[PDB]
């Protein structure tokens, strides 16, 4: 029941600041050392901070003097205070639990990640369009022109799991576009309703668009 | 400063075959660690202290090495093992990572399922017209998509996006979008999506007429 839930991510202008948090459950928080590791848009992994038993903190050279890690052993929360951010700091930020019995060091559980973007571009909500056109039919949803990532796409409030996949966003100079597709039996649609629910946290947006026949 | 260089950067294995990946280091390290990241997921620890299996990890996974050279091995490859594999070093200045080995599972060749969609009426009222094509559930990954407008090829304004190997059925999918203004869209009639995959010698075609 070990769980690590990060939050705090978003968009910052260059040189701004932001504070990440990670809420731990299912183990004795205080007994473990903890780390933050980020994954860049190219998918390189990069260690950014540790806090070890006894309270010592360690940082690589490229963040020393700008990041500060700390912990709240009362409510079991890890923090990463980020300041004087730069565009190279754009990444998925993971919080990790450190292995206890090891001759070295390693990270035996990772959260799900919280996304940070550092850019002078402006927050823009998405436009959401339906994709309507055999024994199976394929439907879709076009999510065009938002910033920053990410967007979240579900079908019929999660009721549809199989037959759904979502394509990675593509960035066209300052705006992302992505698409999502679902396949259902011909005898399910149009006689019943298919809706794509899109959420954009950066802009506080949540739309639900019905797919309707032509 | 210790640089870890993994190889090969991409590899592909048939089911039930033995697989080995390597991590060469810029100089000696004390210990090596291996993580597995499946598409859409967080890294997961597999091997710690160069040769120890981490708790919960199937027995077909093995590590070894020493000095500057380390390896991970899967004795009998299975579909759930398709992922990106990273090594990480411990030493006096620890926690640099390799770039990753991406491992795909071989499966039976599958032809793409092709779909094309004309613009939505909502988009048209704002002056825009996106034509979208999905190419779903194919293997192998290599594929080409051609747009034809009124029987002639079109290359400008086209954006592609590809998925990762699906962990469930091990296939690939692809998206292609042709974005025009309403005005350019209404000066032509036939829109066609042309997919060439090794599963077929002639292309798979789908099309619609704007006024049909
Ligand atoms: O956890 C870390 O990120 C840092 O760990 C230190 O090692 C600890 C280890 O974490 C504990 O499990 C064990 O009980 O004690 C060890 C005490 O050393 C590493 O020393 C530290 O590595 C680097 O060390 C350099 C000095 O040797 C320092 O210049 C680096 O900034 C530091 O990263 C590691 O970061």
Q: Count of H helices and E strands in chain A? A: 0, 19
Phi-psi group of A15: left, alpha or beta (phi > 0 → left; psi -120 to 50 → alpha; rest → beta) = left
Beta-bridge partner residues of B116 = B133
Say which DSSP state B139 is in.
B
**DSSP assignment of A8-66, as one string?**
---EE-TT--EEEEEEEESS-GGGS-EEEEEE-TT--EEEEEEE-TTS-EE--TTTTTT
Mutate to test the interface with A, among B10, B32, B40, B45 (most CBs of A within 10 A): B45
- Whether the Cβ atoms of residue B175 and residue B85 lie closer than 8 Å to each other: no
Give every CB contact of residue B19 below 8 A, 6+ residues apart in sequence. B11, B13, B73, B74, B77, B81, B103
> Could you tell me whether strands B204-209 and A152-155 are parallel, antiparallel, or unpaired per DSSP bridges?
unpaired
Q: What is the resolution of this structure in A?
A: 2.3
Cα nearest neighbour of A47 on chain B: B95
- What is the spatial distance between Cα B81 and Cα B83, in angstroms, rounded to a whole number? 6
Fold classification of A3-118 is Immunoglobulin-like (2.60.40)
User: Could you tell me the strand order of the sheet in which B61-66 lies?
Assistant: B4-7, B19-25, B69-74, B61-66
The DSSP element (H or E) to which B124 belongs, if any, is helix B121-125
Say whether residue A144 is in contact with chain B using an 8 A CB cutoff. yes
Binary contact (B45, A144; C-beta < 8 A): no
Contact B133, B193 (CB under 8 A): yes
Q: Which residue of A has its CA nearest to B92?
A: A104
How many angstroms from the chain centroid is the CA of residue A68?
21
Answer yes or no: do A103 and B31 touch at CB < 8 A. Answer: yes
End-to-end CA distance of chain A: 48
The answer to whether B134 faces chain A, any CB pair under 8 Å, is yes
Asked if B21 and B9 touch (Cβ cutoff 8 Å), the reply is no
- Of B13, B8, B22, nearest to B87 (Cα)? B22
Same CATH fold assignment for domains A3-118 and A127-211: yes
Atom of ligand 1 nearest to the CA of A102: 12
For chain A, the structural domain boundaries read 3-118, 127-211
Torsion of CA B50, A102, A76, A15, to 10 degrees: -60
d(CA A25, CA A13): 32
Q: Are strands A57-58 and B172-181 parallel, antiparallel or unpaired?
A: unpaired
On the 0-12 / 13-18 / 19+ scale of CB atoms within 10 A, B143 is: buried
What is the pairing mode between strands A11-12 and A114-118? parallel
Q: Cβ atoms within 10 A of the Cβ of A79, count?
A: 18
Q: Are A151 and A199 in contact (CB under 8 A)?
A: yes
Residue A38 C-alpha to ligand 1 middle, in angstroms? 19
B167 and B39 in contact (C-beta within 8 Å)? yes
Pick the closest to residue B114 from A192, A136, A155 (CA basis).
A136
Q: How far is CA B173 from CA A176, B74, B112, B162, in A?
A: 19, 27, 8, 6
Q: How far is the CA of B85 from the centre of ligand 1 (A)?
A: 24
Q: Which helix (DSSP H) or strand (DSSP E) does residue A198 occupy?
A: strand A195-200
CA distance B98 to chain A (A): 8
Contact with chain B for residue A140, Cβ under 8 A: yes
Comparing C-alpha atoms, which of A81, A113, A70, A94 is closest to residue A12?
Answer: A81
All domains in chain B, ordered by first residue:
4-105 (2.60.40.10), 113-209 (2.60.40.10)
Integer Cα distance of A189 and B97 in angstroms: 48
Q: How far apart are alpha carbons A210 and A190 in whole angstroms?
A: 11
Distance CA A29, CA A80 (A): 16
CA distance A170 to A191: 33
B44 neighbourhood in chain A, CB within 8 Å:
110
Question: Any idea what DSSP says for residue B76?
Answer: S
Q: Which of A102, A113, A167 sits opposite B49 (nearest CB)?
A: A102
The distance of A47 to chain B (nearest Cα, Å) reads 6
If DSSP states are collapsed to H, E and C, what string results for B157-192? CEEEEECCCCCCCCCEEEEEEEEEEHHHHCCCCEEE
Q: What was the structure determination method?
A: X-ray
Please give the C-alpha separations between residue B127 and each of A171, B124, B130, B181, B185, in angstroms, as whole numbers: 21, 5, 10, 6, 10
Residue A26 CB coordination number (10 Å): 11
The Cα angle at residue A63 between residues A58 and A64, in degrees rounded to 5 = 55
Quote the ligand 1 centre to A58 CA distance (angstroms).
7
CATH class for the region spanning A127-211: mainly beta
As to burial, measured by CB atoms within 10 angstroms (0-12 exposed, 13-18 middle, 19+ buried), residue B31 is buried
Contact call for residues B21 and B85 (beta carbons, < 8 A): yes
Buried b (16+ CB within 10 A) or exposed e, A80-95: bbbeebeeebbbbbbb
Half-sphere exposure of A170 (CA within 13 A, CB side): 16
The number of residues in chain B equals: 212
Q: Which of B198, B142, B139 is nearest to B170 (CA)?
A: B139
Where do we find the tokens 């439907």?
A139
B80: which DSSP letter?
G
Strands A205-210 and A175-185: unpaired
- Rounded distance between C-alpha atoms, residue A204 and residue A5, angstroms: 20
């Amino acid at each position: 029941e070990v769980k690590l839930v990060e939050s705090g991510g978003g968009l910052v202008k260059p040189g701004g600041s932001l504070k990440l948090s990670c809420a731990a459950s299912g183990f004795t928080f205080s007994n473990y050392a903890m780390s933050w590791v980020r994954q860049t848009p190219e998918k390189r992994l990069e260690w950014v901070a540790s806090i070890i038993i006894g309270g010592n903190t360690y940082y690589p050279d490229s963040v020393k003097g700008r990041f500060t890690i700390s912990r709240d052993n009362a409510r079991n929360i890890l923090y990463l205070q980020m300041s004087s951010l730069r565009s190279e700091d754009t990444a998925m930020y993971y919080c990790t639990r450190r292995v206890v019995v090891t001759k070295g060091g390693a990270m035996d559980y990772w959260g799900q990640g919280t996304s940070v973007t550092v850019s002078s571009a402006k927050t823009t909500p998405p436009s959401v369009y339906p994709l309507a056109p055999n024994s199976m039919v394929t439907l879709g949803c076009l999510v065009k022109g938002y910033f920053p990532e990410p967007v979240t796409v579900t079908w019929n409030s999660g009721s549809l799991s199989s037959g759904v996949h979502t394509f990675p966003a593509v960035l066209q100079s300052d705006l992302y576009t992505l698409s999502s597709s679902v396949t259902v039996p011909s005898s399910t649609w149009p006689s019943e309703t298919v809706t794509c629910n899109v959420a954009h946290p950066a802009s506080s947006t949540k739309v639900d668009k019905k797919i309707v026949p032509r | 400063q210790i640089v870890l260089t993994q190889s090969p950067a991409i590899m592909s294995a048939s089911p039930g075959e033995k697989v080995t990946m390597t991590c060469s280091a810029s100089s000696s390290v004390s210990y090596m660690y291996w993580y597995q990241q499946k598409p859409g997921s967080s890294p997961r620890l597999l091997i710690y202290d160069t040769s120890n299996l981490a708790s919960g990890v199937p027995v077909r996974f093995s590590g070894s090495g020493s000095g500057t050279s380390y390896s991970l091995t899967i004795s009998r490859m299975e579909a759930e093992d398709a992922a990106t594999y990273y090594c990480q070093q411990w030493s006096t200045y620890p926690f640099t990572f390799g770039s990753g080995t991406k491992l795909e599972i071989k499966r039976a060749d599958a032809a793409p399922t092709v779909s094309i969609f004309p613009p939505s009426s909502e988009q048209l009222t704002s002056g825009g017209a996106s034509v979208v094509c999905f190419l779903n559930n194919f293997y192998p990954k290599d594929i080409n998509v051609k747009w034809k407008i009124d029987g002639s090829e079109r290359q400008n304004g086209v954006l592609n996006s590809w998925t990762d190997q699906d962990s469930k059925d091990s296939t690939y999918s692809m998206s292609s979008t042709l974005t025009l203004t309403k005005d350019e869209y209404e000066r032509h009639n036939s829109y066609t999506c042309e997919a060439t995959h090794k599963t077929s010698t002639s292309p798979i075609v789908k099309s619609f007429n704007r006024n049909g």
